[model samples]
Target: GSSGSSGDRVTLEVGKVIQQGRQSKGLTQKDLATKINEKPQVIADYESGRAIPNNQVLGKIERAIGLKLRGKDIGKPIEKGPRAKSGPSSG
Candidate 1:
């Protein structure tokens, strides 16, 4: 729940996305570190693909950077509601 394994780890894609998104938003590693309450070195290591962050921290990073870490854009959370029937609105 908290650790990463070789098979399920944060990849370069995550770091790359983070780096790009972070830069696009005009943030330095230190700035991001401060915002996310992580050490600057941790950010550097992640950006360099040296370590995978814990899933918990990974989530915090997502919100801090405003970018999805994986799977075709995290996108807005789907609202909890009833689904429509497989038909047009019973007009």
Candidate 2:
């Protein structure tokens, strides 16, 4: 039997992992939000699985938390340094 369908959204698994990662790093919702330049409510909504997912925000979170939250390497540790594009190509 199939339960009611859940439309496109970040799964609770990801949310739990995000929460765990944040806690493991001793970061509060506000702390993370400030790090990612997002609002605390956005972080809360994400952890509660009530917010829509977007790549830009996810990328910010990944870079801020040093965790690969997407791609085949999901849940893997990443370098905590911000990536600086070393090129000037206007195209």
Residue 29 lDDT (model 2): 77
lDDT of 1 at 86: 22
Where model 1 places Cα greater than 4 Å from the true spot, the runs are: 1-11, 72-91
Give the CA lDDT, 0 to 100, for residue 13 in model 2: 45
**lDDT on C-alpha atoms for all candidate structures:** 0.62, 0.67
| Candidate 2 per-residue C-alpha lDDT over 3-71 given as tens digits, one digit per residue, 9 for 90 to 100 | 123355454544665776787789987888889998877777777567786889988888666777665
Q: For residues 5-70, what per-residue lDDT tens digits would candidate 1 score against the true structure? A: 335444365576667667767998777788889887788778757867678777877776666655
- In model 2, the Cα lDDT at residue 61 comes to 82
* Model 2 weakest 10-residue run by lDDT: 82-91
TM-score of 1: 0.63
RMSD of 2: 11.2
- Steric clash pairs (candidate 2): none
Q: What lDDT is reached at residue 47 by model 1?
A: 70
